[PDB]
RNA sequence: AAAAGAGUGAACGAGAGGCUCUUCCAACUUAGGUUGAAAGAGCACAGGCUGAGACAUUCGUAAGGCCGAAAGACCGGACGCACCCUGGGAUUUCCCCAGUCCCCGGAACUGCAUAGCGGAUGCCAGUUGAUUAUCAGAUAAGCCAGGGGGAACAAUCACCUCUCUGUAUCAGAGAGAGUUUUAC
DNA sequence: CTGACCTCGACTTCTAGTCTCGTTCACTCTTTT
DNA sequence: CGAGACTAGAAGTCGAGGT
């Protein structure tokens, strides 16, 4: 039934055992030591032979649903897994990091220099300068001081560079392979190959010549295409294009393609982006879309690098397999549809003489990936200026900020009398900070009952102590009565 | 090689908002207080590194072309710079990395000519301690800071059978050789 | 004459979090010619 | 093949008790 994994005296993985009673005998006799709860790994204390057999590992890639399965010389499955990768959160985190540091450089460095320049009299006589930097054709506006040097002309990268998200997914695949190697003797590795065309899957029955001329053929960039389809004037008025607005904001999964961008003048952008009626009107004229091809892009980028480095890890014992071959295998041997039986079929592909092939039974070991680091310090810099009459909210700022659909103080001031303004009470709460030394998700803790769990969330804080620890199963444990056993493991088995 | 498709990394610039304070006006209230309009000033993850580097005006920034009375304009790209390259550093850690930035040099690659860099004048800091001199302190219009992986740390007994409890399930507790082999 | 109606640990429920553009640049992968 | 949520803090329940 449930296979038990074995390791020798030396740190060498070894063929898994299934007797399941000899294991308890060896454990009670001191011959065996437990190494991992789940999967249940035992390390022999007494020395013995190390005679192993080849095992084929089969990999079904992905961005959030990686899956690997291990099989013997014949079609017997000794390991099945599923992985939920943290990958999707990396692009958003890097985006927010860029925005935060741009804020840092603007507000602490740039604006402070401009302020000092105006104070000390060492500012432009015009008070503003148009500077045409090398590499661009339209100037920039430098107010009261020259800009800090801009570096975009020449920034070479090592060939084969990969973005932090794609590099993260590559590292995650390889890391899960290493963790599987720690458990079992893996001889061959079989990686599924996925190549995607995103001109395809948008329109099947695509004709060959269509691949070269698409929505943005000839017309240079998305901005120019929008300025063309709108005839060079704002979408609302007859005024010229100023800002290229996203119909779906980039804070959501707003696409960067053509069907999302729209040209608008200044005032029209401000109104459509603060007011509600204008937003509804623009949503009426055009719809926009999400990204819809953010995952498969990263997967397609990393597949060749993964195949290369798998070949490095398993010299002379690395193969490949097509998704179509997997589908044929499922149709042939009757494997049910799933997203982890894919790995079993992929592994079974390489088997030259497979006569015991049958579908695995039992749920596979699920793996969650948790942050290895979190170096943020501010939880909620509130930045909102709330006005109340009595105990009811009536305005959220003095004047509307960008993306403020709700009223502000100027509109209330217009609508009501000066007595109502004189009878307002303001409450603006201060900034909240995370505890950067807190116990992080993925840690292994034990509660008052002695139950062992993996910390998934920390919820609620009072007087400097967490209130609740939420395990991966969603159970909530009182934080004061829980004991800290193990730190964050990069990938945690559930 | 090109045209497209899809992603996601980098530098620089403007705002809408936000915090604190000053002046002034208005409203509402026990001269005071509260809210607001207007003008101005300062400030902007928690923090690490460093002691100068930010700013304005002006001069200079190769050969060779080419047009100009000339001044000088355009091309070009070095004996000028660099985001480029070798080495060394800050962020930097339990071990690393990405990104940004810095310092002496610059050979091939790469990029710039209104940019960068250097010079000159001007403007913006700190000055205390232990033995004029040396080690400490103070000194921002300086750099970085919300990215990622790994190691190590269990109250680490899985499966099945049997018993007890509760529990609709199943959980907890206890006890058990259930094929010899964890490999033939 | 309590005691019915407070006061206080100690938990349990629940909600909320910044956002626009502008001048450029770089890397990866796929599909057709 | 895949498109928020972890963490901090305020308001709320509730028993002990107690006066
Ligand atoms: Mg597949
Ligand atoms: Mg907009
Ligand atoms: Zn207009």
Tab-separated table of N, CA and C in Angstrom, chain A residues 367-473:
chain	number	residue	atom	x	y	z
A	367	UNK	N	2.465	20.031	-2.486
A	367	UNK	CA	3.552	20.883	-2.033
A	367	UNK	C	3.135	22.331	-2.209
A	368	UNK	N	3.339	23.125	-1.169
A	368	UNK	CA	3.102	24.556	-1.245
A	368	UNK	C	4.436	25.268	-1.170
A	369	UNK	N	4.571	26.338	-1.933
A	369	UNK	CA	5.767	27.156	-1.880
A	369	UNK	C	5.471	28.420	-1.093
A	370	UNK	N	6.362	28.748	-0.167
A	370	UNK	CA	6.198	29.906	0.691
A	370	UNK	C	7.363	30.857	0.475
A	371	UNK	N	7.138	32.126	0.794
A	371	UNK	CA	8.203	33.112	0.694
A	371	UNK	C	9.394	32.675	1.526
A	372	UNK	N	10.583	32.776	0.944
A	372	UNK	CA	11.782	32.545	1.732
A	372	UNK	C	12.199	33.816	2.457
A	373	UNK	N	11.860	34.973	1.896
A	373	UNK	CA	12.124	36.259	2.520
A	373	UNK	C	10.897	37.145	2.408
A	374	UNK	N	10.763	38.069	3.349
A	374	UNK	CA	9.841	39.187	3.232
A	374	UNK	C	10.446	40.366	3.969
A	375	UNK	N	10.951	41.337	3.216
A	375	UNK	CA	11.685	42.456	3.786
A	375	UNK	C	10.934	43.770	3.626
A	376	UNK	N	9.610	43.725	3.715
A	376	UNK	CA	8.798	44.927	3.794
A	376	UNK	C	8.607	45.321	5.249
A	377	UNK	N	8.390	46.614	5.489
A	377	UNK	CA	8.230	47.110	6.846
A	377	UNK	C	6.908	47.812	7.097
A	378	UNK	N	6.286	48.386	6.077
A	378	UNK	CA	5.047	49.136	6.234
A	378	UNK	C	3.880	48.247	5.839
A	379	UNK	N	2.940	48.063	6.761
A	379	UNK	CA	1.755	47.275	6.454
A	379	UNK	C	0.723	48.113	5.718
A	380	UNK	N	0.267	49.195	6.343
A	380	UNK	CA	-0.740	50.063	5.744
A	380	UNK	C	-0.389	51.505	6.075
A	381	UNK	N	0.308	52.183	5.170
A	381	UNK	CA	0.431	53.630	5.258
A	381	UNK	C	-0.886	54.236	4.807
A	382	UNK	N	-1.720	54.639	5.767
A	382	UNK	CA	-3.146	54.796	5.499
A	382	UNK	C	-3.422	55.892	4.476
A	383	UNK	N	-2.887	57.090	4.700
A	383	UNK	CA	-2.890	58.168	3.710
A	383	UNK	C	-4.292	58.640	3.327
A	384	UNK	N	-5.292	58.444	4.183
A	384	UNK	CA	-6.658	58.862	3.882
A	384	UNK	C	-7.132	59.826	4.955
A	385	UNK	N	-7.865	60.851	4.547
A	385	UNK	CA	-8.257	61.947	5.421
A	385	UNK	C	-9.776	61.959	5.538
A	386	UNK	N	-10.305	61.254	6.531
A	386	UNK	CA	-11.734	60.985	6.622
A	386	UNK	C	-12.439	62.053	7.444
A	387	UNK	N	-13.572	62.530	6.929
A	387	UNK	CA	-14.415	63.510	7.599
A	387	UNK	C	-15.740	62.856	7.970
A	388	UNK	N	-16.212	63.107	9.187
A	388	UNK	CA	-17.478	62.576	9.663
A	388	UNK	C	-18.318	63.694	10.256
A	389	UNK	N	-19.626	63.617	10.039
A	389	UNK	CA	-20.601	64.393	10.791
A	389	UNK	C	-21.312	63.452	11.749
A	390	UNK	N	-21.051	63.616	13.035
A	390	UNK	CA	-21.545	62.644	13.989
A	390	UNK	C	-20.745	61.368	13.849
A	391	UNK	N	-21.375	60.336	13.297
A	391	UNK	CA	-20.694	59.075	13.096
A	391	UNK	C	-20.834	58.527	11.693
A	392	UNK	N	-21.098	59.396	10.722
A	392	UNK	CA	-21.299	58.989	9.339
A	392	UNK	C	-20.206	59.582	8.466
A	393	UNK	N	-19.681	58.771	7.551
A	393	UNK	CA	-18.655	59.244	6.633
A	393	UNK	C	-19.276	60.114	5.551
A	394	UNK	N	-18.650	61.254	5.273
A	394	UNK	CA	-19.166	62.181	4.275
A	394	UNK	C	-18.126	62.609	3.252
A	395	UNK	N	-16.834	62.438	3.520
A	395	UNK	CA	-15.796	62.836	2.583
A	395	UNK	C	-14.500	62.150	2.976
A	396	UNK	N	-13.668	61.865	1.976
A	396	UNK	CA	-12.486	61.041	2.187
A	396	UNK	C	-11.184	61.803	1.959
A	397	UNK	N	-11.233	62.985	1.359
A	397	UNK	CA	-10.042	63.803	1.161
A	397	UNK	C	-10.496	65.239	0.963
A	398	UNK	N	-9.537	66.162	0.988
A	398	UNK	CA	-9.885	67.543	0.675
A	398	UNK	C	-10.361	67.670	-0.764
A	399	UNK	N	-9.578	67.166	-1.712
A	399	UNK	CA	-9.972	67.100	-3.109
A	399	UNK	C	-9.667	65.700	-3.611
A	400	UNK	N	-10.448	65.245	-4.587
A	400	UNK	CA	-10.331	63.869	-5.049
A	400	UNK	C	-8.914	63.557	-5.508
A	401	UNK	N	-8.405	62.406	-5.082
A	401	UNK	CA	-7.171	61.855	-5.613
A	401	UNK	C	-7.473	60.996	-6.833
A	402	UNK	N	-6.423	60.626	-7.559
A	402	UNK	CA	-6.607	59.778	-8.727
A	402	UNK	C	-7.211	58.445	-8.303
A	403	UNK	N	-8.186	57.968	-9.078
A	403	UNK	CA	-8.987	56.795	-8.716
A	403	UNK	C	-9.704	56.964	-7.385
A	404	UNK	N	-10.338	58.107	-7.170
A	404	UNK	CA	-11.247	58.279	-6.044
A	404	UNK	C	-12.639	58.535	-6.604
A	405	UNK	N	-13.456	57.483	-6.639
A	405	UNK	CA	-14.824	57.621	-7.122
A	405	UNK	C	-15.714	58.283	-6.079
A	406	UNK	N	-15.441	58.043	-4.801
A	406	UNK	CA	-16.262	58.597	-3.738
A	406	UNK	C	-15.984	60.088	-3.566
A	407	UNK	N	-16.929	60.773	-2.927
A	407	UNK	CA	-16.852	62.218	-2.785
A	407	UNK	C	-15.630	62.622	-1.968
A	408	UNK	N	-15.333	63.916	-2.006
A	408	UNK	CA	-14.260	64.516	-1.237
A	408	UNK	C	-14.794	65.763	-0.555
A	409	UNK	N	-13.894	66.527	0.063
A	409	UNK	CA	-14.342	67.657	0.867
A	409	UNK	C	-14.834	68.818	0.018
A	410	UNK	N	-14.281	69.009	-1.179
A	410	UNK	CA	-14.734	70.125	-2.001
A	410	UNK	C	-16.178	69.932	-2.447
A	411	UNK	N	-16.548	68.704	-2.807
A	411	UNK	CA	-17.905	68.453	-3.276
A	411	UNK	C	-18.910	68.568	-2.140
A	412	UNK	N	-18.562	68.043	-0.967
A	412	UNK	CA	-19.413	68.242	0.198
A	412	UNK	C	-19.533	69.721	0.537
A	413	UNK	N	-18.415	70.446	0.496
A	413	UNK	CA	-18.434	71.877	0.770
A	413	UNK	C	-19.394	72.597	-0.159
A	414	UNK	N	-19.380	72.234	-1.441
A	414	UNK	CA	-20.311	72.834	-2.388
A	414	UNK	C	-21.751	72.452	-2.064
A	415	UNK	N	-21.983	71.184	-1.721
A	415	UNK	CA	-23.350	70.700	-1.567
A	415	UNK	C	-24.011	71.242	-0.304
A	416	UNK	N	-23.260	71.373	0.782
A	416	UNK	CA	-23.822	71.756	2.068
A	416	UNK	C	-23.341	73.142	2.487
A	417	UNK	N	-23.863	73.608	3.616
A	417	UNK	CA	-23.599	74.965	4.066
A	417	UNK	C	-22.340	75.022	4.925
A	418	UNK	N	-21.962	76.246	5.302
A	418	UNK	CA	-20.760	76.443	6.099
A	418	UNK	C	-20.905	75.904	7.513
A	419	UNK	N	-22.131	75.812	8.031
A	419	UNK	CA	-22.325	75.207	9.346
A	419	UNK	C	-21.943	73.735	9.329
A	420	UNK	N	-22.350	73.017	8.283
A	420	UNK	CA	-21.996	71.609	8.176
A	420	UNK	C	-20.488	71.430	8.110
A	421	UNK	N	-19.793	72.338	7.424
A	421	UNK	CA	-18.337	72.269	7.377
A	421	UNK	C	-17.747	72.573	8.745
A	422	UNK	N	-18.343	73.517	9.468
A	422	UNK	CA	-17.847	73.863	10.790
A	422	UNK	C	-18.139	72.794	11.829
A	423	UNK	N	-19.016	71.844	11.530
A	423	UNK	CA	-19.354	70.789	12.476
A	423	UNK	C	-18.799	69.428	12.086
A	424	UNK	N	-17.685	69.383	11.364
A	424	UNK	CA	-17.099	68.111	10.976
A	424	UNK	C	-16.006	67.697	11.951
A	425	UNK	N	-15.845	66.386	12.113
A	425	UNK	CA	-14.754	65.814	12.890
A	425	UNK	C	-13.920	64.935	11.974
A	426	UNK	N	-12.608	65.085	12.053
A	426	UNK	CA	-11.683	64.406	11.158
A	426	UNK	C	-10.987	63.278	11.904
A	427	UNK	N	-10.879	62.115	11.265
A	427	UNK	CA	-10.095	61.011	11.814
A	427	UNK	C	-9.214	60.419	10.724
A	428	UNK	N	-7.902	60.536	10.906
A	428	UNK	CA	-6.913	60.028	9.966
A	428	UNK	C	-5.947	59.109	10.697
A	429	UNK	N	-6.158	57.797	10.689
A	429	UNK	CA	-5.306	56.910	11.486
A	429	UNK	C	-3.884	56.863	10.956
A	430	UNK	N	-2.954	56.539	11.849
A	430	UNK	CA	-1.540	56.552	11.521
A	430	UNK	C	-1.120	55.240	10.860
A	431	UNK	N	0.133	55.207	10.410
A	431	UNK	CA	0.628	54.081	9.632
A	431	UNK	C	0.834	52.850	10.502
A	432	UNK	N	0.626	51.678	9.909
A	432	UNK	CA	0.792	50.398	10.585
A	432	UNK	C	1.965	49.653	9.971
A	433	UNK	N	2.738	48.969	10.806
A	433	UNK	CA	3.951	48.297	10.369
A	433	UNK	C	3.903	46.818	10.721
A	434	UNK	N	4.369	45.984	9.797
A	434	UNK	CA	4.543	44.569	10.078
A	434	UNK	C	5.670	44.365	11.078
A	435	UNK	N	5.632	43.232	11.764
A	435	UNK	CA	6.770	42.808	12.562
A	435	UNK	C	7.705	41.998	11.682
A	436	UNK	N	8.815	42.605	11.272
A	436	UNK	CA	9.700	41.951	10.320
A	436	UNK	C	10.364	40.702	10.881
A	437	UNK	N	10.309	40.492	12.195
A	437	UNK	CA	10.888	39.318	12.830
A	437	UNK	C	9.828	38.301	13.228
A	438	UNK	N	8.634	38.400	12.658
A	438	UNK	CA	7.557	37.496	13.013
A	438	UNK	C	7.833	36.097	12.480
A	439	UNK	N	7.077	35.133	13.000
A	439	UNK	CA	7.144	33.777	12.480
A	439	UNK	C	6.492	33.748	11.108
A	440	UNK	N	7.196	33.217	10.137
A	440	UNK	CA	6.654	33.385	8.801
A	440	UNK	C	5.868	32.158	8.365
A	441	UNK	N	4.961	32.330	7.406
A	441	UNK	CA	4.239	31.181	6.859
A	441	UNK	C	5.207	30.126	6.358
A	442	UNK	N	4.810	28.870	6.492
A	442	UNK	CA	5.665	27.747	6.190
A	442	UNK	C	6.381	27.200	7.397
A	443	UNK	N	6.416	27.952	8.490
A	443	UNK	CA	6.995	27.450	9.721
A	443	UNK	C	6.161	26.298	10.254
A	444	UNK	N	6.804	25.426	11.016
A	444	UNK	CA	6.150	24.257	11.584
A	444	UNK	C	6.011	24.468	13.080
A	445	UNK	N	4.772	24.455	13.567
A	445	UNK	CA	4.477	24.755	14.957
A	445	UNK	C	3.636	23.639	15.555
A	446	UNK	N	3.525	23.668	16.878
A	446	UNK	CA	2.737	22.704	17.632
A	446	UNK	C	1.888	23.466	18.640
A	447	UNK	N	0.630	23.057	18.782
A	447	UNK	CA	-0.337	23.804	19.571
A	447	UNK	C	-0.464	23.220	20.976
A	448	UNK	N	-1.421	23.756	21.736
A	448	UNK	CA	-1.605	23.307	23.107
A	448	UNK	C	-1.973	21.841	23.205
A	449	UNK	N	-2.790	21.357	22.271
A	449	UNK	CA	-3.141	19.944	22.265
A	449	UNK	C	-1.975	19.069	21.831
A	450	UNK	N	-0.875	19.668	21.391
A	450	UNK	CA	0.237	18.924	20.853
A	450	UNK	C	0.123	18.593	19.386
A	451	UNK	N	-0.897	19.101	18.703
A	451	UNK	CA	-1.056	18.848	17.281
A	451	UNK	C	-0.029	19.639	16.483
A	452	UNK	N	0.488	19.012	15.432
A	452	UNK	CA	1.515	19.598	14.584
A	452	UNK	C	0.865	20.206	13.353
A	453	UNK	N	1.222	21.451	13.041
A	453	UNK	CA	0.664	22.113	11.874
A	453	UNK	C	1.722	22.986	11.216
A	454	UNK	N	1.420	23.401	9.990
A	454	UNK	CA	2.263	24.292	9.206
A	454	UNK	C	1.597	25.656	9.154
A	455	UNK	N	2.258	26.658	9.718
A	455	UNK	CA	1.680	27.990	9.783
A	455	UNK	C	1.408	28.527	8.386
A	456	UNK	N	0.140	28.815	8.102
A	456	UNK	CA	-0.263	29.388	6.825
A	456	UNK	C	-0.508	30.888	6.912
A	457	UNK	N	-1.189	31.342	7.960
A	457	UNK	CA	-1.445	32.763	8.154
A	457	UNK	C	-1.256	33.138	9.614
A	458	UNK	N	-0.843	34.377	9.840
A	458	UNK	CA	-0.895	34.991	11.158
A	458	UNK	C	-1.994	36.038	11.138
A	459	UNK	N	-2.999	35.875	11.990
A	459	UNK	CA	-4.185	36.713	11.937
A	459	UNK	C	-4.420	37.364	13.289
A	460	UNK	N	-4.586	38.680	13.286
A	460	UNK	CA	-4.961	39.373	14.496
A	460	UNK	C	-3.777	39.612	15.401
A	461	UNK	N	-3.635	40.835	15.897
A	461	UNK	CA	-2.557	41.165	16.813
A	461	UNK	C	-3.121	42.011	17.938
A	462	UNK	N	-2.652	41.765	19.158
A	462	UNK	CA	-3.053	42.537	20.328
A	462	UNK	C	-1.858	42.682	21.255
A	463	UNK	N	-1.481	43.926	21.541
A	463	UNK	CA	-0.421	44.233	22.501
A	463	UNK	C	0.886	43.530	22.149
A	464	UNK	N	1.187	43.456	20.859
A	464	UNK	CA	2.453	42.925	20.406
A	464	UNK	C	2.532	41.420	20.291
A	465	UNK	N	1.416	40.712	20.407
A	465	UNK	CA	1.415	39.265	20.278
A	465	UNK	C	0.331	38.840	19.305
A	466	UNK	N	0.694	37.943	18.388
A	466	UNK	CA	-0.266	37.413	17.433
A	466	UNK	C	-1.451	36.831	18.182
A	467	UNK	N	-2.637	36.942	17.590
A	467	UNK	CA	-3.812	36.353	18.215
A	467	UNK	C	-4.054	34.940	17.713
A	468	UNK	N	-3.970	34.729	16.405
A	468	UNK	CA	-4.351	33.452	15.826
A	468	UNK	C	-3.305	32.987	14.829
A	469	UNK	N	-2.996	31.697	14.883
A	469	UNK	CA	-2.197	31.015	13.874
A	469	UNK	C	-3.137	30.139	13.060
A	470	UNK	N	-3.179	30.358	11.755
A	470	UNK	CA	-4.045	29.599	10.870
A	470	UNK	C	-3.188	28.608	10.105
A	471	UNK	N	-3.440	27.322	10.321
A	471	UNK	CA	-2.704	26.271	9.647
A	471	UNK	C	-3.139	26.166	8.192
A	472	UNK	N	-2.448	25.300	7.452
A	472	UNK	CA	-2.779	25.113	6.046
A	472	UNK	C	-4.161	24.495	5.881
A	473	UNK	N	-4.672	23.846	6.926
A	473	UNK	CA	-6.009	23.273	6.846
A	473	UNK	C	-7.096	24.268	7.212
